[PDB]
Amino acid sequence: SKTINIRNANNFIKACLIRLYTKRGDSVLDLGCGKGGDLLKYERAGIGEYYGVDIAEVSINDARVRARNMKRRFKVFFRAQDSYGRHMDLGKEFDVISSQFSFHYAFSTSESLDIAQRNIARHLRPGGYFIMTVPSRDVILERYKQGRMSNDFYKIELEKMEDVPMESVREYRFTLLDSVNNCIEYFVDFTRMVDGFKRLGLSLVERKGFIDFYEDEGRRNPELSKKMGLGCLTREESEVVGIYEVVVFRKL
Numbered sequence: 561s562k563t564i565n566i567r568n569a570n571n572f573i574k575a576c577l578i579r580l581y582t583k584r585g586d587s588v589l590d591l592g593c594g595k596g597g598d599l600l601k602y603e604r605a606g607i608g609e610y611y612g613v614d615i616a617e618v619s620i621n622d623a624r625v626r627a628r629n630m631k632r633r634f635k636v637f638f639r640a641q642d643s644y645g646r647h648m649d650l651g652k653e654f655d656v657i658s659s660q661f662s663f664h665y666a667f668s669t670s671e672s673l674d675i676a677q678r679n680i681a682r683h684l685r686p687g688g689y690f691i692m693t694v695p696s697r698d699v700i701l702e703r704y705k706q707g708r709m710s711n712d713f714y715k716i717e718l719e720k721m722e723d724v725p726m727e728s729v730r731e732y733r734f735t736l737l738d739s740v741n742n743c744i745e746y747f748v749d750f751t752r753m754v755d756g757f758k759r760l761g762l763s764l765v766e767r768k769g770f771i772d773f774y775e776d777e778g779r780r781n782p783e784l785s786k787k788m789g790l791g792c793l794t795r796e797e798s799e800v801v802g803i804y805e806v807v808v809f810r811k812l
């Protein structure tokens with residue numbers, strides 16, 4: 561109830577992102593699909609097939625039910641496995657691969673990132689898109705320097721000092737009211753990611769902050785904006801939303 565606006569905002573951003581890169585009869589691969597909270601958004605997008613994959617069986621389970629009890633028109637598929645630090649071969653390619661609030665987990669180790677980016681590349685059709693929403697390292701480090709690493713909605717704490725450069729840290733603890741607790745998150749080495757992808761035939765096509773992206777899409781699509789209590793957002797709520805950014809790669 562307290563994090564309602566944040567959730568609405570986030571779903572909105574995801575709904576818009578999905579809208580911008582999907583078209584009818586499209587095939588989507590949803591990595592880190594969680595409980596399938598995007599099936600509805602994809603239903604409206606008129607997609608033909610949806611493949612959800614998540615490492616946590618408990619989430620893939622709730623996702624199966626959601627798809628099982630919803631009025632959808634697309635063919636669904638779910639699989640509980642590791643799509644980042646373990647090889648993945650679903651035997652097919654998709655038009656759109658989506659990774660919402662999950663791809664930063666692929667930065668566990670250099671090997672994990674490599675495997676992860678390779679699972680993406682072999683499942684993406686030539687011309688396909690890989691849309692994602694990941695925490696922004698720049699934002700997070702800049703907030704660290706300002707001493708504002710938290711509020712009543714969330715809380716973040718980095719690694720140990722002891723001559724350790726602020727740029728040396730690779731992970732941090734993240735907590736979100738009514739959500740994850742002391743969740744270990746890995747920073748997104750942006751450049752390494754771009755490089756890894758550029759080497760697999762995928763190039764950066766988009767990078768925009770949640771807040772900015774939010775403002776733009778809401779002032780362009782006042783329609784889907786009325787579908788919920790959008791419009792404004794307190795300062796404390798923006799803190800949380802302002803953590804993530806939109807990144808979109810494309811397979812030439």
Ligand SMILES: Nc1ncnc2c1ncn2[C@@H]1O[C@H](CSCC[C@H](N)C(=O)O)[C@@H](O)[C@H]1O
Binds near residue numbers: 619
């Ligand atoms: N290697 C991996 N493969 C697939 N999912 C992973 C993963 N590591 C972490 N995750 C998943 O990442 C998800 C992040 S939150 C899931 C939210 C969902 N994409 C949404 O848009 O609401 C969790 O469900 C977690 O289990």
